[PDB]
Design a protein around this ligand. Structure first.
Ligand SMILES: CC(=O)/N=c1\sc(S(N)(=O)=O)nn1C
Ligand SMILES: CC(=O)/N=c1\sc(S(N)(=O)=O)nn1C
Ligand SMILES: [Cl-]
Ligand SMILES: [Cl-]
Ligand SMILES: [Zn+2]
Ligand SMILES: [Zn+2]
Lengths: 221, 225
């Protein structure tokens, strides 16, 4: 109950100091997030999403989280990665070619061997997107969340190996950062940021050791 | 208390236990070597230009289960406007990385460091066959206390290689290593093969394949000279 985003002691630059489990926050060579600037052009990525009702929806450790039953899958290279939860970071943590959007959502998965697959996608200030509403009315039954409709059908993405953007900053993370921004309204932006206590929950860009990145594309649905 | 590839306490399964400097040997998520089966095909935007010449080793000696030739900082690799000087060339038998589950009887690692200590290792396998003329200058320098190494002739002109980030394959298992594994195997004679294993004291110095956390690998090819 110690680490936060405050620019003083419990801030990110000192996370390794708060606890030894966070030592990799400093010592690891694949820490996330980063600015995606150098990559290689070149699917094998299957979504198994459905509109799903959350096991629970809650704000925890400074983000808004919807936890889920092991019913929604992503298959990657012939291995099934179960979605655990989707949570939000504001502003966006990852950067693409020096570009920033004010919000992202992370879709967290784990396979048979316990390996992590996380998805980062942006929101763009503009028209109100309906997908947000089933979770924002879930403080208490829980209404179904439209997962198979959340992401674009056609996606361009960046894939690389990184770490968690939050303590313990565990590595072995397969990142897929989606290029296409989703849309978010200005009223929704401020409203949900208030559940982010209008206090940023975004880890700074980590040092980049020539991460190998592929740019590819896929169809989600 | 020193690390080995032997069956008991100082083996690879236990390197982490030998020294705390070696903790990442087990706990790291980007540990080498691995079995290369999944990769991405790509184009040649690859900024990898060799700056190699024939060079006489500062020394050729046995250290840590391998045969090593260290060099004057005269031989280089350039990668995206980032130049890596060759530190040494050393050997593994059998080859430590696997290319589609295929095993080579031997490999060579071209170990580089930039100014700030960033690591680039270059790996190529060897296949039993014709007398390799480049090898014996090394086999002719180890009992002395050194002849030019035809580095300018050592690697193939046209290479297919795999690129990714991994670790050193021996303790301290340092991560953040830019690996370039070249697909085309070089050629070695049966006695060149036999003899050097004895200079590597006939005790295999091959770290087992490590857990792979979906390492992102690209396949491309290039011209060295
Ligand atoms: C359960 C879960 O998803 N935990 C997470 S996710 C995460 S992140 N924001 O994807 O890098 N950091 N932590 C602690
Ligand atoms: C000086 C030097 O090259 N040391 C090395 S190289 C190496 S390797 N087998 O290339 O990953 N492991 N260690 C300890
Ligand atoms: Cl992000
Ligand atoms: Cl190897
Ligand atoms: Zn997240
Ligand atoms: Zn080696």
């Amino acid at each position: 109950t110690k680490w936060d985003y405050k620019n003083k002691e419990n801030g990110p630059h000192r996370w390794d100091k708060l606890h030894k489990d966070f030592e990799v926050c400093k010592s690891g060579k694949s820490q996330s997030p980063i600015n995606i600037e150098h990559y290689y052009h070149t699917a094998d990525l299957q979504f198994k999403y459905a509109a799903s009702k959350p096991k629970a929806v809650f704000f925890t450790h400074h983000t808004l989280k919807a936890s889920f039953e092991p019913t929604n899958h992503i298959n990657y290279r012939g291995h099934d990665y179960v979605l655990d939860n989707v949570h939000f970071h504001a502003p966006m943590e990852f950067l693409i070619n020096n570009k920033t959007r004010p919000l992202s959502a992370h879709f967290v998965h784990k396979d048979a061997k316990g390996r992590l697959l996380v998805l980062a996608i942006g929101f763009e200030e503009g028209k109100e997107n309906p997908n947000l509403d089933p979770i924002l009315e879930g403080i208490q039954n829980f209404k179904e969340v439209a997962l198979d409709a959340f992401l674009p059908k056609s996606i361009n993405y960046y894939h690389f190996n990184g770490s968690l953007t939050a303590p313990p900053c565990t590595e072995g993370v397969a990142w897929f950062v989606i290029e296409e921004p989703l849309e978010v309204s200005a009223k929704q932006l401020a409203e949900i940021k208030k559940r982010m206590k209008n206090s940023p929950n975004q880890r700074p860009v980590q040092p980049d050791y020539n991460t190998v990145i592929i740019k590819s594309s896929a169809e989600t649905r």
